[PDB]
Symmetry: C4
Subunit: 263 residues, 4 copies
């Protein structure tokens, strides 16, 4: 009553498709392993953010919408660039670094003790450098003035923008926690769900905040544009609050042993 | 002829990705387990409906279409917010509560005896409170008048709207029954299919009814807007009829032992 | 070196998610089994085509595009209704009838000897009745004149339309053959790929032919509109040619034992 | 503690859904096996590029956007045609040829030693002939002048276009390497990720270069239009550079034994 697995096909069963941080135990603090993790975060964050920056540049060449109105097709395009861009980046780098590609996601995972603090700082630094490189590349590669930096819009105040950014980032981070960090038959598929979470968070936030949801995404274009709005802090504090909210929900479920009827 | 599973990778095989209601047997009536289920429905319904309400708010800032015409890009955006929003919510909460996020889905599952009536009532109450919280949050977070409450449009009568809502809800509930409640190799993937079902149901209904398809989705914005149209009942009776239709089809297939050639 | 499967989780492994026709051997010619198959095709085809007809009705209320031009957002909406509509229908009915939902797909599968001719005729008749019911329901449920019947457009001739319909249907049928009929680790996922194939085929065909790709989809609206264009035959012959082309490619690969390096 | 697999269901476990090149060992140099591989690349590339060419033809009938601006809905439609078109093609041909459908992808895989050079040349030649056939068919099937040939736009220079094409092709090729060539539990799903990578690469490139990303995609329409721009070379050199960049990253990760904490 077992189905035969041919020896040439055993790798597709034995080689689990799991985030790299699930297997960062003893031995992980070598220079080699720190470099692997940094290289995954650099490559992944660069390709995700470069892609999404060029896509936003293009989408923002659409004719202006009167009276401050929204442009649904434009918003869909930009959300695809970030949502599908992160999906591809995370699928590529999942077994390299785990594909965080976002200092707020790394923060949630350090709070959850999925990633130790020093490795987490290395990853976050890498993501921010990658975002600076992506912004510089996207600027160099496109004509016109930079149109992919974050700014308030749509009549949103700074306070509203802070809360939009926090709850959007929370959705993203809770997705990573429940699909990638939690170990089950759907862990392999987490990069898909993470990408859809980011897609959604962009449909919520682009019109009002530009959609930061990721300090590395917001910092790099500000550097490249040589321009920091005085409300730039919302793109740091909002995602940090969202990481903590997501962690807090996950932690409650872990204390409750959520997945088991009779612990 | 078996492929080796390394002990560190056994959790990805042994921990099934299955809806929580599949494992609610003896022991389930503890306060702990009722609270777990309520917390999954609250978190999931809040994040799904909050997201989708803000997305609809934004989409409804598009310039008006003349002569009552439709705006396909706008309709696509809103359908993404509800369809992908529910997808993310259900993937997050699948092993917490099963991710119903909708009193009509809970009703279908109580009729199918997947969920017992008292737990079902607790879940439905939770969903309605979550929808009120989401509406209040989305209103507080966005400028302008609320634009995410349901209303008839597109020249549709109340009777047409009732039938559109019933058949759209039936599609959703039959999806949950056949992909999540029925146990097979695709059960793990049900949250994806459920989200696409809801996406479709929004492309059918937004233009004509606003797309309720979920009494908790329709009630909360009416509370927040301090406004109930006299036809609000279609957003309760239509989804209830759809739950019964879906249940009736599933029940026929169960009586027939559909999946087996020679019972 | 094996991972434990808890007895309550064995159904998710032992109950394969496979099309019903894979298991239609001895015993299949009972009235019960013919009725099961017909009921799957009726329910699936009705929900798919009803959904997609209402979605097309709505999309076709968009303001007219000047000079015969195309409207990409409108075309995307309609393609979503048919592509995601068929995806949901096939996922629901996969283990009931196999989810053909299309006489041309049934024809390809009768040529491939996946489905015997008498059962195939029963299924095709059912699909055509379902399409008539869906058209009548969609008409009854929506205001205005029917806008979901097929017609030539975009400057396309009948001959061009015949070839567009044939090659689009071939893509669909080759997808079913290679993902659902062929037995492998991705068979379970065929409903997804089938839906994307149909999505693509609609982006190819709507503007020029209305996108028939399915005689049951084309016949029912003509009945409901009390209107058959003299070129209606392209919506029968084109899909029949496409079924044969797909079958011919698959048959060549089967003769070649494509999947095996050293037969 | 094992779940029963019924003998009729063993094929869905034993028949791995893996790219054909994973199993091209001894015996592969027969005429039969060369023909199988060529037939997969021909069928797959023809259906992908034919589909996407007709879709682009249609999308390019949209009313002109003033002042050189972008049209997000149009760009989304075209990206769907190539991204979902390649997805369907690769799912169909995965176990036939591996579904490269692109000389630059074949080049990356020859550099990675996944495909030997002579077979690789045969595949690339086939892809280019398929692209010529697809262009000729799409032209013959549609009214109007050909609108699916690549050209610079959006104010992009040749140098910018070369770099956009190189980095977009790199994303595609790194996706193939890390999801299809690398052997793990997600290899079966690589056709999905490959299609999303191509979707993204089109949202980056269409507006500025037309999106070549594939010498067979760029050559065939130039032949059919009897028109080669003097910058046509960017559609060869850009994808070749991208293949090398992707290979270089993958090779670094292979030298590092990326997937293992303690080699
Ligand atoms: C002398 C004591 C040496 C202790 C070496 C312990 C190395 C544990 O190392 C861990 O092993 C697991 C496999 O068992 C892997 O999954 C982890 O990737 C790895 O970090
Ligand atoms: C890895 C990223 C390298 C990208 C290099 C960007 C391409 C340079 O592009 C050049 O920019 C000039 C102004 O800077 C313009 O005047 C040129 O005509 C344009 O080609
Ligand atoms: C919604 C309540 C928490 C978010 C509030 C964001 C306030 C942003 O506003 C900041 O408030 C600070 C404290 O009052 C003042 O010190 C700063 O000058 C002011 O910019
Ligand atoms: C406390 C939140 C974290 C902020 C991250 C560091 C980004 C700050 O960065 C700095 O912004 C200043 C604005 O006054 C500028 O003058 C500098 O130009 C800018 O680089
Ligand atoms: C086995 C791990 C579970 C730990 C015991 C959980 C018992 C608490 O159970 C729940 O706690 C909630 C507090 O958030 C209360 O609101 C609920 O009323 C209560 O049922
Ligand atoms: C003295 C009698 C005590 C009866 C205790 C029965 C507990 C059954 O409990 C059930 O067990 C299943 C595992 O077997 C789990 O899947 C279910 O989650 C759980 O509800
Ligand atoms: C968890 C949800 C908490 C969200 C709080 C909403 C943000 C408050 O936002 C404020 O609303 C005022 C009117 O109410 C406006 O006048 C302000 O300028 C706007 O900032
Ligand atoms: C399509 C037939 C079933 C749906 C019918 C919806 C009727 C909604 O209309 C209601 O009909 C009731 C009964 O006649 C009257 O009592 C109510 O006043 C009227 O509002
Ligand atoms: C029978 C269908 C279920 C209805 C769910 C309860 C919602 C009713 O709710 C009530 O609607 C009334 C309209 O007359 C109002 O006057 C109240 O303002 C409103 O809260
Ligand atoms: C093994 C479980 C199957 C129960 C026996 C089913 C026998 C009925 O079989 C079917 O019943 C339908 C009623 O809906 C009739 O319309 C069909 O003609 C008949 O074939
Ligand atoms: C006296 C001879 C009676 C012959 C009865 C043969 C029944 C075969 O029946 C077949 O069995 C397979 C399981 O083995 C199932 O997968 C198929 O669904 C079923 O059609
Ligand atoms: C299962 C499908 C049943 C759907 C019934 C369709 C709803 C009837 O709808 C009615 O159509 C009339 C004209 O026919 C209009 O005049 C009405 O005001 C409209 O309500
Ligand atoms: C492209 C070649 C095959 C498709 C051709 C479609 C021809 C549709 O045209 C039909 O051609 C028939 C045969 O000449 C004539 O008998 C019919 O009157 C004419 O309508
Ligand atoms: C040979 C292709 C199959 C055609 C399927 C049958 C559809 C024909 O149907 C018939 O079309 C005629 C047009 O002359 C009409 O007069 C009838 O109104 C119509 O129902
Ligand atoms: C083991 C099953 C494989 C059957 C033998 C296949 C041998 C034919 O092989 C191929 O046949 C093609 C015909 O379409 C020719 O075009 C090719 O040149 C030839 O290599
Ligand atoms: C006399 C020596 C003959 C050597 C024949 C070796 C054939 C190896 O052939 C390989 O076998 C593998 C299965 O083991 C398959 O996966 C590969 O597809 C196949 O190329
Ligand atoms: C496999 C691809 C075969 C496709 C054949 C294309 C259809 C021929 O189509 C014809 O093109 C003529 C000009 O060439 C036009 O004048 C016709 O009226 C149009 O029908
Ligand atoms: C960005 C730097 C690498 C890409 C540069 C693309 C240059 C395309 O420009 C080419 O440059 C060649 C070498 O100077 C000259 O020989 C060619 O005439 C000129 O067309
Ligand atoms: C070196 C990059 C590879 C180029 C691939 C071959 C395509 C060249 O092709 C040739 O382009 C020439 C332009 O001068 C033309 O005159 C010919 O018309 C054209 O077919
Ligand atoms: C077991 C296979 C791993 C081979 C040994 C890798 C040791 C190199 O390790 C890394 O090399 C990088 C070079 O790219 C350096 O930048 C890093 O500082 C270093 O940690
Ligand atoms: C990507 C974001 C990385 C988060 C790094 C958080 C840095 C906090 O790390 C802290 O860990 C404490 C252990 O409890 C130590 O006591 C402190 O010294 C240390 O600063
Ligand atoms: C989310 C919607 C929850 C549906 C709850 C339905 C409430 C009906 O529950 C009913 O169950 C019956 C058992 O047959 C009892 O006899 C009744 O007393 C009870 O009201
Ligand atoms: C959905 C479309 C169903 C296709 C049914 C095709 C009907 C052809 O079936 C044919 O089978 C032959 C066996 O070789 C018989 O000899 C013929 O009598 C019979 O008509
Ligand atoms: C689709 C693109 C196919 C790439 C084919 C690359 C052709 C290079 O192949 C090369 O292989 C070398 C082995 O090191 C030989 O020494 C050379 O003779 C040969 O040209
Ligand atoms: Cl260590
Ligand atoms: Cl403020
Ligand atoms: Cl109990
Ligand atoms: Cl009415
Ligand atoms: Cl029988
Ligand atoms: Cl003609
Ligand atoms: Cl050989
Ligand atoms: Cl240049
Ligand atoms: Cl899977």
């Amino acid at each position: 009553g077992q189905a035969e697995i041919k020896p040439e096909d055993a790798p597709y069963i034995t080689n689990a498709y799991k985030p790299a941080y699930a297997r960062w135990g003893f031995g992980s603090d070598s220079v080699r392993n720190h470099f692997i993790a940094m290289s995954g975060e650099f490559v992944g964050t660069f390709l995700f953010l470069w892609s999404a920056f060029v896509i936003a540049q293009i989408a923002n060449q659409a004719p202006e919408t009167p009276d401050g109105g929204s442009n649904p097709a434009q918003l869909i395009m930009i959300s695809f660039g970030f949502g599908f861009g992160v999906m591809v980046g995370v699928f590529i780098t999942y077994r390299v670094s785990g594909g965080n590609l976002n200092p707020a996601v790394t923060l949630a995972l350090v709070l959850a003790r999925a990633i130790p603090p020093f490795r987490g700082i290395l990853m976050a630094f890498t993501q921010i450098v990658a975002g600076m490189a992506a912004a510089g590349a996207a600027s160099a590669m496109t004509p016109g003035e930079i149109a992919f930096a974050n700014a308030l819009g749509g009549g949103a105040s700074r306070t509203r923008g802070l809360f939009l950014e926090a709850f959007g980032t929370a959705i993203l981070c809770l997705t990573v926690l429940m699909l990638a960090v939690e170990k089950h038959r759907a862990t392999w598929f987490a990069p898909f769900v993470i990408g859809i979470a980011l897609l959604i968070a962009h449909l919520i936030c682009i019109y009002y905040t530009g959609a930061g949801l990721n300090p590395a995404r917001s910092f790099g274009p500000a550097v490249a544009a040589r321009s920091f709005p005085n409300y730039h802090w919302i793109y740091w504090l909002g995602p940090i609050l969202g990481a903590f909210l997501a962690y807090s929900i996950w932690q409650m479920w872990k204390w409750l042993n959520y997945q088991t009827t009779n612990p």
